[PDB]
Design a protein around this ligand. Structure first.
Ligand SMILES: [Ca+2]
Ligand SMILES: [Ca+2]
Ligand SMILES: [Ca+2]
Lengths: 112, 112
């Protein structure tokens, strides 16, 4: 049965170390939709990558420089970013904060 | 061509009035994934509803009482909620704050 629990409580879920200055919690998901909370320290880099999944991100807090398909924009709390299937994208955290990354379908690699 | 722009800047997107004390911005989406930012005043109610879409929500801020399939839980900033296809769910805002609701596939009704 491939899905998260119903209530994903931050203080009950393990933070996974993703890289230097980057930690994440996988929150609500099934095979078609996955929501990930990613906490960045200043200076941390989301390495450029491509994947077939659709991705839609929300900036909860902090300030980030994002690039999507070669285009750069600084985004801040309240802003969103859409990454169509297979587009190159990544980010650098300018001030510590949280992103919510969402995916369709799920990122099987994030649980396996 | 069914999708949002790449960079969804809060100060460039219209807030839509959804109901009493509830406003939303549709952020990054395509036909398979849609991310919605929903700002609630204290007291506001997300009416109980059912839909075939998968939904995964993140509590950005505030405090909410959620019900999913008849089960109630208070959630707060950092917590998530997963709503499998067709489950009855809704919420009441106990302290003003923001939810990110994500859907697969998109909520066609939110743009049409
Ligand atoms: Ca799908
Ligand atoms: Ca990505
Ligand atoms: Ca719903």
């Amino acid at each position: 049965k491939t899905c998260s629990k119903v209530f994903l409580l931050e203080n009950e879920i393990s933070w996974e170390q993703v890289g230097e200055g980057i930690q994440r919690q996988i929150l609500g998901y099934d095979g078609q939709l996955m929501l990930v909370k990613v906490k960045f320290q200043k200076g941390a880099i989301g390495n450029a990558h491509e994947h077939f999944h659709s991705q839609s991100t929300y900036v909860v807090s902090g300030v980030f420089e994002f690039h999507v398909n070669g285009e750069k924009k600084i985004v801040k709390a309240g802003d969103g970013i859409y990454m169509e299937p297979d587009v190159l994208h990544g980010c650098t955290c300018l001030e510590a904060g949280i992103l919510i990354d969402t995916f369709s379908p799920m990122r099987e690699d994030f649980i396996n």
